[PDB]
Amino acid sequence: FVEMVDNLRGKSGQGYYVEMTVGSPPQTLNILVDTGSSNFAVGAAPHPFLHRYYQRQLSSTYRDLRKGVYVPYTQGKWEGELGTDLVSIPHGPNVTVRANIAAITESDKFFINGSNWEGILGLAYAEIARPDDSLEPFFDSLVKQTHVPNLFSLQLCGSEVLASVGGSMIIGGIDHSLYTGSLWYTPIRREWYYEVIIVRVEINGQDLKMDCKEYNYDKSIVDSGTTNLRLPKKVFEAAVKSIKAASSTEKFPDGFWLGEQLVCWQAGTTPWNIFPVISLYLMGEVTNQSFRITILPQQYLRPVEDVATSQDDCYKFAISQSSTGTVMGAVIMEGFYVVFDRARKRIGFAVSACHVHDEFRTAAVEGPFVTLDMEDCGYNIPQTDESRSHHHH
Ligand SMILES: C[C@]12CCCO[C@@H]1[C@]1(COC(N)=N1)c1cc(-c3cccnc3F)ccc1O2
Numbered sequence: 095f096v097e098m099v100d101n102l103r104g105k106s107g108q109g110y111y112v113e114m115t116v117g118s119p120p121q122t123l124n125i126l127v128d129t130g131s132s133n134f135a136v137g138a139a140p141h142p143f144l145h146r147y148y149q150r151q152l153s154s155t156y157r158d159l160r161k162g163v164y165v166p167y168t169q170g171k172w173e174g175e176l177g178t179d180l181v182s183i184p185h186g187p188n189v190t191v192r193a194n195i196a197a198i199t200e201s202d203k204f205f206i207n208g209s210n211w212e213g214i215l216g217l218a219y220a221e222i223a224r225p226d227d228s229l230e231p232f233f234d235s236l237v238k239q240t241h242v243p244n245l246f247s248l249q250l251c252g253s254e255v256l257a258s259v260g261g262s263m264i265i266g267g268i269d270h271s272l273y274t275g276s277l278w279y280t281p282i283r284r285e286w287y288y289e290v291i292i293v294r295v296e297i298n299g300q301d302l303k304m305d306c307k308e309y310n311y312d313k314s315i316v317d318s319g320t321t322n323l324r325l326p327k328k329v330f331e332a333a334v335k336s337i338k339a340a341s342s343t344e345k346f347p348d349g350f351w352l353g354e355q356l357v358c359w360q361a362g363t364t365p366w367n368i369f370p371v372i373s374l375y376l377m378g379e380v381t382n383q384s385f386r387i388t389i390l391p392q393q394y395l396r397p398v399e400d401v402a403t404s405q406d407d408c409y410k411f412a413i414s415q416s417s418t419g420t421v422m423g424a425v426i427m428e429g430f431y432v433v434f435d436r437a438r439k440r441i442g443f444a445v446s447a448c449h450v451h452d453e454f455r456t457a458a459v460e461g462p463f464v465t466l467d468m469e470d471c472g473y474n475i476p477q478t479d480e481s482r483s484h485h486h487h
Pocket residue numbers: 107108109110126128129130131165166167204214317318319320321
């Protein structure tokens with residue numbers, strides 16, 4: 095999969111994107127790679143943050159579906175018109191498919207100034223597609239229309255402009271050059287988000303000792319479309335307390351722990367060793383087994399270059415509170431080669447050949463850990479009448 099290696103780009107904290115083409119003749123757009131959503135949607139009208147957009151009128155193969163779509167979220171929305179057109183990934187498989195495309199005609203706090211992407215590729219399942227689960231997601235169409243295996247894998251690699259990032263999205267396979275050591279699999283609990291189960295959390299080798307359901311309240315997901323490691327309120331509080339205690343030689347402002355303020359050291363003198371490793375134990379394929387993924391401060395402290403002090407190394411704390419469960423975002427994924435094995439309903443982790451580390455510690459993937467009579471760590475989201483009333487024909 096040499097032709098697919100190094101096909102992702104982006105700016106730190108602003109998402110990873112892949113080049114895609116839409117229409118006939120092909121119109122190139124940069125598309126956010128998002129395992130936390132399920133729509134393929136592209137800017138299709140002028141916007142202050144867009145240099146270019148999908149021009150449906152220029153495409154001989156465009157078909158209007160005569161249906162609108164409206165997608166609200168916390169402090170924003172995108173909306174537009176549904177259609178289909180021919181889509182390819184220039185640095186991906188040598189195939190062209192007819193996919194659903196949402197042509198974004200209006201948005202609020204969707205596009206990001208300077209992110210260099212013009213659309214979003216939702217790689218998650220139909221259950222969370224808008225307007226409903228009958229709108230076939232891109233990857234489903236790709237698999238159904240081509241001989242491409244039902245699997246993709248992601249290797250995300252972490253003064254006036256933000257830092258450039260790179261990575262690989264390998265579609266239809268696993269590239270052995272992108273990882274070292276063992277590849278460990280956790281089950282996809284349910285096909286909507288890429289939902290997984292965390293059975294144990296340690297901070298510098300010390301167990302948080304919480305009821306494991308707390309780790310997955312109200313879900314845990316693997317999400318390339320979220321920058322941070324996001325943790326449920328109670329878990330976040332325990333983690334922050336433990337990390338503060340380890341790094342206690344340094345007294346940072348409250349703003350730092352909230353992700354609202356940078357902390358700096360003189361260039362090259364960052365005391366990495368005062369910050370603890372964080373281990374998340376994920377449910378194994380075998381009932382009473384787990385494996386752990388371990389990340390370093392190099393992953394959860396994000397570099398941000400400061401104009402006012404360019405001779406310092408400055409960092410943002412990239413673990414944040416969630417009210418919608420654990421989110422294993424770019425902070426987690428940058429440690430690892432992550433295999434989204436849809437065919438076998440499982441997610442694989444191995445140490446990334448590109449992860450940032452030092453001479454003392456490394457991001458790790460280790461197992462098995464067996465637990466006699468393992469508890470159920472999964473949370474069952476209370477069923478609303480809304481959800482219950484839906485028929486699924
Ligand atoms: C809010 C939605 C539209 C509705 C569905 O969720 C989308 C979301 C939020 O979380 C994920 N997984 N994708 C999303 C993430 C980013 C982003 C921003 C910064 C860095 N990386 C990114 F992916 C930008 C836009 C965006 O749009």
